[PDB]
Amino acid sequence: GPSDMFVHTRDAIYKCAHLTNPTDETILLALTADLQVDSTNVPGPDVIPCCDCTAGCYYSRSKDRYFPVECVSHDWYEIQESGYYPKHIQYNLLIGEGHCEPGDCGGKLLCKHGVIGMITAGGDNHVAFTDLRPYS
Ligand SMILES: [Zn+2]
């Protein structure tokens, strides 16, 4: 569960858009958030809180462990060119100090109340999460 690179709530599945494709169960697609949301008939264990938290813990796939992390909100952020996207702007980010490598996208960010984010980009001791709360 903690290692899953997606968020699975009672009614929906949240994935990083570049890691999937639109399907007939897609209910939200936002490339400005690198986010795809699909409806699902099978209930999931995760909960997206309506809290205000910016601090918690996240899964790092490259290190294969969880890290504590403290984040700051950014309305928008410049993501550098990768392999799936050109250099572009993304919206609603949480940014914290922490390790991040290519391949870590989708790793969950949790506060006490539930999952609030997913790794979407990161670099030199910075990790960027899309805040899922605006989109739930
Ligand atoms: Zn919280």
Side-chain angles (χ1 to χ4, degrees), residues 38-123:
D38 290 26
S39 65
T40 184
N41 271 340
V42 340
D46 304 324
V47 172
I48 304 168
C50 287
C51 70
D52 61 319
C53 293
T54 48
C57 53
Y58 76 97
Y59 175 67
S60 169
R61 192 181 84 103
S62 57
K63 297 297 188 186
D64 202 27
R65 53 157 287 195
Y66 267 75
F67 287 100
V69 67
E70 307 84 5
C71 302
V72 192
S73 291
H74 284 85
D75 276 355
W76 56 267
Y77 199 72
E78 185 155 307
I79 313 299
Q80 298 308 316
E81 172 169 48
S82 71
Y84 41 85
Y85 291 141
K87 155 184 172 153
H88 69 288
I89 302 312
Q90 281 192 26
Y91 295 92
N92 298 116
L93 289 107
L94 300 154
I95 315 279
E97 339 175 59
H99 175 78
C100 185
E101 289 177 19
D104 291 350
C105 300
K108 291 183 278 181
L109 169 62
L110 293 98
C111 68
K112 163 206 173 52
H113 304 114
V115 189
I116 61 177
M118 274 188 304
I119 297 181
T120 190

Side-chain angles (χ1 to χ4, degrees), residues 5-7 13-17 19-20 34-37 118:
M5 315 290 274
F6 57 84
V7 182
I13 302 165
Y14 299 70
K15 309 189 106 183
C16 278
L19 255 15
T20 187
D34 190 23
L35 182 69
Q36 170 169 332
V37 188
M118 274 188 304

